[PDB]
Amino acid sequence: TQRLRIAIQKKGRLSQECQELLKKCGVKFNIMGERLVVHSLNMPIDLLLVRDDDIPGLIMDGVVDLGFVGENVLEETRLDRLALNQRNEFTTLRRMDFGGCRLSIAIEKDAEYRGPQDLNGKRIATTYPQLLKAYMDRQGVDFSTCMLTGSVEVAPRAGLADAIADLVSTGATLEANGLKEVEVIFESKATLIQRPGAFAADKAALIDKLLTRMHGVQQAKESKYIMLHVEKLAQIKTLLPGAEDPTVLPLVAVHMVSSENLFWETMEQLKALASSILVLPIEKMME
Amino acid sequence: QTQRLRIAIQKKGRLSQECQELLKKCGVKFNIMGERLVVHSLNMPIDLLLVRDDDIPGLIMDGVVDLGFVGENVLEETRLDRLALNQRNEFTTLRRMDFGGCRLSIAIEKDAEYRGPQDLNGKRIATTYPQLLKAYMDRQGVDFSTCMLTGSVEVAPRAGLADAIADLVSTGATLEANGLKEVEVIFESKATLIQRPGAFAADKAALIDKLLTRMHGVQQAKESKYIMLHAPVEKLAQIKTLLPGAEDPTVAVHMVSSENLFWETMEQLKALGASSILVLPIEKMME
Amino acid sequence: TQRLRIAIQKKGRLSQECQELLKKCGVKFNIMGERLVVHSLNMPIDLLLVRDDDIPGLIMDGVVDLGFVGENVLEETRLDRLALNQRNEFTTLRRMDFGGCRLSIAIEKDAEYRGPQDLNGKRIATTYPQLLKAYMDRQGVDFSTCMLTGSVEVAPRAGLADAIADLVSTGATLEANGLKEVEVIFESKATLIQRPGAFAADKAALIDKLLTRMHGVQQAKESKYIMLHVEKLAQIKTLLPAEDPTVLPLKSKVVHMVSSENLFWETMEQLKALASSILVLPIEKMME
Amino acid sequence: TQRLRIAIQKKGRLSQECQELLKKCGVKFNIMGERLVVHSLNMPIDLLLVRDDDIPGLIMDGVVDLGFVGENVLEETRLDRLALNQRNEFTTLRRMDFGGCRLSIAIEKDAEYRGPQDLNGKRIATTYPQLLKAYMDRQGVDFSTCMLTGSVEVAPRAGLADAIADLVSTGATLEANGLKEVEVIFESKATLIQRPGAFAADKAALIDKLLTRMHGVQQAKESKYIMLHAPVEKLAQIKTLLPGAEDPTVPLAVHMVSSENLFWETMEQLKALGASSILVLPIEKMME
Amino acid sequence: QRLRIAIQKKGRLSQECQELLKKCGVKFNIMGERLVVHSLNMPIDLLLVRDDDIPGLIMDGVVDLGFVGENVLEETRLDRLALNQRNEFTTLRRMDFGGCRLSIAIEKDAEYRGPQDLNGKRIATTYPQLLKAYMDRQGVDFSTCMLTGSVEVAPRAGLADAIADLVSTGATLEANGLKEVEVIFESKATLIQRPGAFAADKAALIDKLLTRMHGVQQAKESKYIMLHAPVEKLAQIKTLLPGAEDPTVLPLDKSKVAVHMVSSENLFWETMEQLKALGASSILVLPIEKMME
Amino acid sequence: QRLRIAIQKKGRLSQECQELLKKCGVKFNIMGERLVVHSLNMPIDLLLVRDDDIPGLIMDGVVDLGFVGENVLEETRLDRLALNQRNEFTTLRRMDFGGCRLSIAIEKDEYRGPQDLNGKRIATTYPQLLKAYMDRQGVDFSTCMLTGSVEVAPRAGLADAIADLVSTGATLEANGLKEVEVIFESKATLIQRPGAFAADKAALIDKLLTRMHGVQQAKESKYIMLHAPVEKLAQIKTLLPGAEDPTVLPLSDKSKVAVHMVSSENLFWETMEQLKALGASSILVLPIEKMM
Ligand SMILES: Nc1ncnc2c1ncn2[C@@H]1O[C@H](COP(=O)(O)OP(=O)(O)OP(=O)(O)O)[C@@H](O)[C@H]1O
Ligand SMILES: Nc1ncnc2c1ncn2[C@@H]1O[C@H](COP(=O)(O)OP(=O)(O)OP(=O)(O)O)[C@@H](O)[C@H]1O
Ligand SMILES: O=P(O)(O)OC[C@H]1O[C@H](OP(=O)(O)OP(=O)(O)O)[C@H](O)[C@@H]1O
Ligand SMILES: O=P(O)(O)OC[C@H]1O[C@H](OP(=O)(O)OP(=O)(O)O)[C@H](O)[C@@H]1O
Ligand SMILES: [Mg+2]
Ligand SMILES: [Mg+2]
């Protein structure tokens, strides 16, 4: 009567990473190419392959149960809706470790920027007018907008705007168009959100199972099994944060699980205190 | 000291290449330097702006560019979205292109009955072109709900999001893939060349006029052909009828057609007893 | 079936060139990707996108009306069938100017070959055992076979056979595997064949229309409009071969005419040796 | 002085997975482009990159020593050969954990199938006529065949046959062409077979070394080092949930090696018994 | 014994050279990374070599003809004149391809009124000889920094005040904080011949090939033009197109006449617009595949 | 002021060098064809230069460290010693990548050994390394210096033989030649400009080197767990001279014991087979991501 409906961006780098995570969590399915409803083989789950821009909208209107989407698109649509008294409520279940990107202010290379107040009175081009307003209201700076749905980087050289606010990762497009990033106003990752309202306890249990699995996939990526050699224990313990007590062994030899990746800096700190520092990977876990 | 003529063309898409091709066939020289979105003409006082197609009517309507290449569908949808918010919406149409053809069509599920528009009365319809859909349904006097999606419209029926859809179509591939059939053409679009409203410096006026006359000539050369054939003298008046064109045939008949010869026309000519039908191309012309 | 059914190889260089020719002849259709029956929008025609290997078989069993296929696959299947008294009759409508390739005998680079008789008693690997037999029987030379359905070029170095008979265009694979082409046994192009038996006169008329159009597409590719500059006219006429040249008005000068073949440099040079202001214009479309 | 000759499919899914396994077993070699005989650098082994369809043929004619091939192609060729009294004997050394796929009967979507008997008298298209016959004889149902070398999915919509028997995984091709899978007739994996007859004891020892290593490569894929905390209550139950060879070692803490992959379901079972800090470490290489 | 022709093995210059030999009716197929290539239908061998070695090979008589950038030719001529090595050759024809330009570039945030602003600055280049030729001609002293590539590194790295590189996009310059400020050499590809005497057969062959290349160029440039003009305007139209043969004229009533003729250049729009202005009509331009005066 | 490192701009050698700096915790992103690259998290500049210029730059002190083929380093050292130019530098570490070999090749159709080259003309892009080789074999030859497409020379009648870089024989077979003699086997190397550093910059190079050592040691090393008879333990220890002292745990019973330890090399199958032969069982090898 009702399977769990999950909205994923149809095509994009964000799509593969979302499909990959559902599969790493033991959700089996095949995309029957260009068909946009995908039925899970082994679980009572439907995938809807939609434009990312529509996903907050769908989640907010209860029309799907779960949704994978950029924090940037989500917050922009929430604000566009709050501006029209449209329902804008949802529950955030988990932040992904992917889809990273940032909304940044950019100006022409040949231009001085001491801070946000240097934009007071200038026109700014953006595809994220709401997130730009939120930032400039917070900095108390007045500006004009120039709304373009893309090719934002055109606007300054084209005499359309004094500056822009765009998504950025590399800065290739910026250099190409005579611009430099000068201010991060929003840092986004993908996020997994849930429609508002009540859930059948079966469907509740399913989402809980899925989430616990996602937690495990992340914890295995991050965590590491560390073995080292003597008798300077408590300081070493502090230098390697983790959940459980380290087991201390025979000839001292310490075995334990880090919660974070071991960095070179940390390894170097340990030699400065320790010897035979090993880090083994962890394929799978559940605390 | 003066602002160059600024022309907006879609940055990336089918429509982009065909527009760049035509400016070059009209003797406008320019080279695209990668992801740079302002392009300066080498030999003419012209700038190109490589923007999203959806923003072009917007730009033209706000006078911020001079000329714009855009789908008749995007243009009419944005004119209506704007008239609904008392925003500018005025522009002048210079010329319809012989490219960018496509149609907005209503589609429903394959195994479902459609006698005519009235069968949609009260159904919810998903579309990226809410205004053009409204225009059509008001003309047919049928009431319906909308469901706005920014893309992947074809998802909506199978997903239980809407009873039907209104999408761009050519082949039907996406429709068949998603369990739908086109049942009703509501808008037929080609690309068009529009001009911002208001006054033009007579230099810039003269330039647009030169460009238009050249565009006419590049189209006339595509359409026109030099034809040479042998016929029975008796069949002359009939042959004349079969080949519409501007000038009289010379004497063996030599002449220039205004339309492309189809096979069917050539077969008609052999039937009149004409022989050695040649069609030579015309690279360039000006009546 | 009441629509004309045409078999085309599904995917391959041969596929594009076949679709292209049907479209140049005014047959409109869209491949709805991975769907293997394609219905024409504007003509009573179905396309079946099948393996090339099955097309002679389908044409011979009347199950399709027309078929585009390599002359090599066609003749091999005809012979495999004649060997099992299976129906192997069909009608060839036209040879294509595409799908060119050749079955060639290849041996190891460091090996001597004075002619076919140097293969007498040797084992030969091929995916075309029938065409190989036809060749060797014609040369009266006895040999063993080693049948492999591909990667034929492996056989000598692998000690499977003394030589091979493979399709060739470049010879990349041959050099890579230590071999040289030494003898062309079969030259193939694609060909358009028709099932045997009777046709409804409507369906007959349709195939005839299509063929006349294909003839015109080819004739326009080959032909050229030539204009040049009084004695030696009859000789010039001979040098440029299907109509009288119209004799120019402007003595010192003159000539306008249509060649049936491409003008080659050699021919142009011959003309200067006799002529001046030699022009060649293309012909987009024609019907003699 | 003849090296051990191993046949692997030249190009396909099955190729990479076979090359990968030879390398994981310490056979070094480099593919030099379109070259089809590949010599091992460090072992007395040649690889032959041939069409998969020819591999059972080669193994059965003793012309190669070992062969990697789909169980489906192998059984079809054994039967096609037994039907022509050609040599069809070989020895199966080991079944691979890759190349999974299944031959399935498919019919048109909007058509009823209660079971095999619904096919009695229908024509069926397939590239695997023998495996289809084997299945239908077992179910005692009579049918016609329509042999196609590929694009089988065309046949029903094209009016060439009532149903088909094709390889299937997702169903994409089937949906695209108006068909539904309704009956699995053969489940295949890749398999490693040996030519029949005697082996020199050196070459025997080498195949045995290779097999023992393959066993170890598989055992390392399957096996995992698991570390967890549990109540001493529910220990015997935990033992049952993690099958392996050795007893688990046990301050708190259980260390052991599983013989199977831990699934999420099993990990969830363990948390339910009240176990905590469940780790699974990979094993690159092993030998019991 | 055959005609030996050197062409750059791989590069934009390679395709355009192979294309031209084929358009001239020389048949051959490249079998991958095979570098000595025989023509099927003509007594001609192709050598696929590095562009930098081609002037060298032609100058040492080891090949007969060579396709190469004017820039690498002049750089090697000078490198050789500096070592009293043979630097003599004959130039047969300038190509209408292989365009590129050696330019001086300096840091964006720096003042440059002209070449004299380089006096005493260090300059990086892959073309040390052409750089010297330029600086001698402007009478300016400078230091060099020779690098075989990645020239654009030098200024940002504090290796050099300026650079002289091949320049095309501008992207690399902007990326590295530089601006082109001065063109020192504009190159096209050229076809050169080894020095010495030729067997008259081999002479005749090169002459045939050259005449064919002339024809391929003349067909690119030329157009068959058909128009209507007032008979009074004909002589004037003739004057406006010095690129023309004498037109064949036919009457149509007697006001206008129909003119058919071959231009030597393409008609620009501007010229076509000039013709409408004289009161000509129905100006058509047909392409020409192949031709020979 | 900051540490300047030269790496080949584009080539297989480039990726492997960038990869190693990142595996050593140096953060940076290449913004297209920008050639001076600043590290985000360390006082380190990267220069993306042509490989041929790297020895030159290191030798002229203009950069601090340089990643480069042993072959181009030795060729430029010799080109320079021939012009009394400074050719001094310090070698920090040999890489386990950038393998390739300069080989002599002649026409397929007689070569008994190097003396068969006496008096023949030879084409190469490495004229110095060719001279070094021929001097070492005491053989005289003519040269033909070309910057590339060396394999042309014999078929073209320019030269009797060639000396080229080789990996596959493809180009050789294509052009009617056979490799007959390896004259130089190269790997990439990490070299340092000559002179004094400043103890900050000294400390940094030392940190980087120790990290590179650790990345290599983790590639090579393995955590091995096995069962053996207690009697066989000392013998097993001997068989793995690559080992730490094993932690040994008794089972259940006292017959077999369980041994956990770290090899310095990977275990070959052959070694694992040797261990089963001593009557060890349940030989497991786990990977090691990182170590020190
Ligand atoms: N088959 C087709 N489907 C869609 N648009 C088509 C088609 N054929 C022509 N067009 C034309 O292309 C125009 C824009 O094409 P394009 O594919 O760039 O659109 P888009 O995907 O909406 O782009 P954008 O990134 O601006 O949203 C349409 O407005 C229409 O006029
Ligand atoms: N989804 C799949 N569909 C078909 N075969 C599969 C699939 N997955 C695995 N296989 C296996 O791969 C084997 C051969 O793979 P491949 O795709 O190269 O075959 P092929 O295209 O029939 O090859 P050939 O060129 O020899 O005709 C099959 O016989 C089967 O055992
Ligand atoms: O079915 P065809 O005639 O081949 O046309 C393909 C259709 O698919 C696209 O729209 P769609 O809304 O499906 O794409 P989206 O994922 O961008 O929303 C495109 O705009 C075409 O209309
Ligand atoms: O349906 P899926 O599980 O996605 O499997 C893909 C299908 O593609 C192949 O058939 P195809 O129609 O391509 O036949 P051909 O190889 O002869 O063209 C293969 O036999 C599979 O059945
Ligand atoms: Mg759009
Ligand atoms: Mg197969």
Which two tokens mark A147? 């709304």
Q: From its phi and psi, is residue E177 left (phi > 0), alpha (psi between -120 and 50) or beta?
A: left
Chain F interface, mutation test: which of E13, E14, E143, E153, most F Cβ atoms within 10 Å?
Answer: E153
The ranges assigned to domains in chain B are 1-99+190-223, 100-189, 224-287
Distance A231 CA to ligand 5 centre (A): 67
Strands F3-8 and F44-49: parallel
Resolution of the experimental model, in Å, one decimal: 2.9
The residues that bridge with B230 in the sheet, in sequence order, are B275
Tally A–E CB contacts below 8 A.
4
Distance D104 CA to ligand 2 centre (A): 14
B53 CB less than 6 Å from ligand 3? no
**In one letter, which amino acid is F268?**
F
Experimental method: X-ray
**In one letter, which amino acid is F261?**
M
Residues of chain C positioned with their CB less than 8 A from the CB of E287: 281-282
Would you give the DSSP letter of residue C246? B
Q: How far apart are CA B103 and CA B76, in angstroms?
A: 13
Do B52 and A148 touch, CB atoms closer than 8 A?
yes
Closest-CA residue, ligand 3 atom 11, reads: B152
B56 CB less than 6 Å from ligand 1? no
Interchain pair B281, E287: CB under 8 A: yes
Distance B74 CA to ligand 5 centre (A): 7
Cα-trace Rg, chain B: 24
D75 CB less than 6 Å from ligand 4? no
Do D246 and D195 touch, CB atoms closer than 8 A?
no
Q: From its phi and psi, is residue E25 left (phi > 0), alpha (psi between -120 and 50) or beta?
A: left
Q: Measured between CB atoms, which of C33, C35, C63 is closest to D160?
A: C63
Interchain pair E275, B282: CB under 8 A: no
Residue with tokens 């704007």: B82
Q: How far apart are CA C277 and CA C263, in angstroms?
A: 14
**In one letter, which amino acid is A179?**
L
From the list F192, E142, D270, D10, the residue with the least C-alpha distance to C176 is: D10
Q: How far apart are CA B195 and CA B57, in angstroms?
A: 10
Q: How far apart are CA A206 and CA A210, in angstroms?
A: 6
- Strands (DSSP E) contained in chain E are 3-8, 36-38, 44-49, 65-69, 90-94, 100-107, 122-125, 143-146, 162-167, 178-187, 189-193, 223-230, 248-251, 256-263, 281-286, 290-292
Do E217 and E269 touch, CB atoms closer than 8 A?
no
Task: Return the number of other C-beta atoms located less than 10 Å from residue C216's C-beta.
Answer: 22
**Distant-in-sequence, close-in-space partners of B82: CB < 8 Å, separation ≥ 6:** B57, B58, B61, B88, B89
Would you give the DSSP letter of residue C247? P
Give the closest ligand to the alpha carbon of residue A54: 3
Preceding-residue numbers of gaps in chain A (C–N over 2.5 Å): 229, 251, 273
Q: Is the dihedral of CA D61, D63, D67, D69 positive or negative?
A: negative
Q: Is the dihedral of CA C258, C261, C265, C269 positive or negative?
A: negative
Task: Return the number of other C-beta atoms located less than 10 Å from residue F100's C-beta.
Answer: 18
Classified as helix, coil or strand, C264 is: coil
- Give me the phi and psi of D267, to 5 degrees please: -60, -40
Q: How far is F105 from chain C (nearest CA, A)?
A: 18
Q: How far apart are CA C63 and CA C72, in angstroms?
A: 21
Q: Is the dihedral of CA C91, C94, C98, C102 positive or negative?
A: positive
Put the strands of the sheet holding A254-258 in their side by side order. A247-248, A254-258, A224-228, A278-280, F290-291
From the list A39, A35, A36, A69, the residue with the least C-alpha distance to A55 is: A69
Distance B77 CA to ligand 1 centre (A): 13
Cα-trace Rg, chain F: 25
Do A223 and A257 touch, CB atoms closer than 8 A?
yes
DSSP letter string, A202-258: HHHHHHHHHHHHHHHHHHHHH-EEEEE----HHHHHHHS--SSPPEE-----EEEEE
Q: How far apart are CA A64 and CA A207, in angstroms?
A: 13
Q: How far apart are CA E217 and CA E26, in angstroms?
A: 16
Looking from the CA of residue B102, the nearest atom of ligand 3 is: 22
From the list C70, C61, C85, the residue with the least C-alpha distance to C18 is: C70
Do C78 and C142 touch, CB atoms closer than 8 A?
no
Looking from the CA of residue D101, the nearest atom of ligand 4 is: 3
Q: What is the 3-state secondary structure (H, E, C) of chain B?
A: CCCCEEEEEECCCHHHHHHHHHHHHCCCCCCCCCCCCEEECCCCCEEEEEECHHHHHHHHHCCCCCEEEEEHHHHHHHHHHHHCCCCCCCCEEEEECCCCCEEEEEEEECCCCCCCHHHHCCCEEEECCHHHHHHHHHHCCCCCEEEECCCCHHHCCCCCCCCEEEEEECCCHHHHHCCEEEEEEEEEECEEEEECCCCCCHHHHHHHHHHHHHHHHHHHHHHCEEEEEECCHHHHHHHHHHCCCCCCCCCCEEEEECCCCCHHHHHHHHHCCCEEEEEECCCEEEC
Do C124 and C164 touch, CB atoms closer than 8 A?
yes
Residues of chain F positioned with their CB less than 8 A from the CB of D247: 251-252
Alpha-carbon dihedral angle through residues F219, F221, F227, F228, given to the nearest 10 degrees:
140
Q: How far apart are CA C210 and CA C170, in angstroms?
A: 33
From the list E44, E63, E40, the residue with the least C-alpha distance to F157 is: E63
Interchain pair C175, E262: CB under 8 A: no
- Give me the phi and psi of D24, to 5 degrees please: -60, -20
Chains adjacent to B (≥3 CB pairs closer than 8 angstroms): A, C, E
From the list B186, B188, B204, the residue with the least C-alpha distance to B196 is: B204
Distance A162 CA to ligand 5 centre (A): 26
**Distant-in-sequence, close-in-space partners of D62: CB < 8 Å, separation ≥ 6:** D195, D196, D197
Residue in chain F closest to D246 (alpha carbons) equals F282
Task: Return the number of other C-beta atoms located less than 10 Å from residue B204's C-beta.
Answer: 17
Residues of chain E positioned with their CB less than 8 A from the CB of B250: 250, 258
Residue with tokens 């330029």: E134
Distance D17 CA to ligand 2 centre (A): 13
**Distant-in-sequence, close-in-space partners of B193: CB < 8 Å, separation ≥ 6:** B67, B68, B69, B93, B94, B95, B96, B97, B215
The residues that bridge with F281 in the sheet, in sequence order, are F227
Preceding-residue numbers of gaps in chain D (C–N over 2.5 Å): 250, 252
Do C283 and C251 touch, CB atoms closer than 8 A?
no
Looking from the CA of residue D71, the nearest atom of ligand 2 is: 31
Interchain pair A286, D263: CB under 8 A: no
DSSP letter string, C107-141: EESS---SSGGGGTT-EEEES-HHHHHHHHHHHT-
Put the strands of the sheet holding A284-286 in their side by side order. A284-286, D276-281, D224-229, D254-258
B41 CB less than 6 Å from ligand 1? no
From the list D158, D133, D154, D152, the residue with the least C-alpha distance to D143 is: D133
| H or E element in which residue F186 lies | strand F177-186
Best residue for ligand 2 mutational test, from D101, D104, D148 (most atoms within 8 Å of Cβ):
D101
Q: How far apart are CA D178 and CA D172, in angstroms?
A: 10
Residue with tokens 């084209």: A158
Which two tokens mark A76? 């922009």
Q: How far apart are CA F131 and CA F134, in angstroms?
A: 5
Q: How far apart are CA A131 and CA E229, in angstroms?
A: 65
Q: How far is B253 from chain A (nearest CA, A)?
A: 53
Q: Which residues of E touch F (CB under 8 A)?
A: 4, 9, 31-36, 47-50, 52-53, 62, 147-150, 152-153, 156-157, 159, 171-172, 175-176
Put the strands of the sheet holding E162-167 in their side by side order. E143-146, E122-125, E162-167, E100-107, E178-187
| H or E element in which residue C220 lies | helix C201-222
From the list C82, C90, C38, C100, the residue with the least C-alpha distance to C61 is: C90
Tally A–B CB contacts below 8 A.
89
D169 CB less than 6 Å from ligand 4? yes
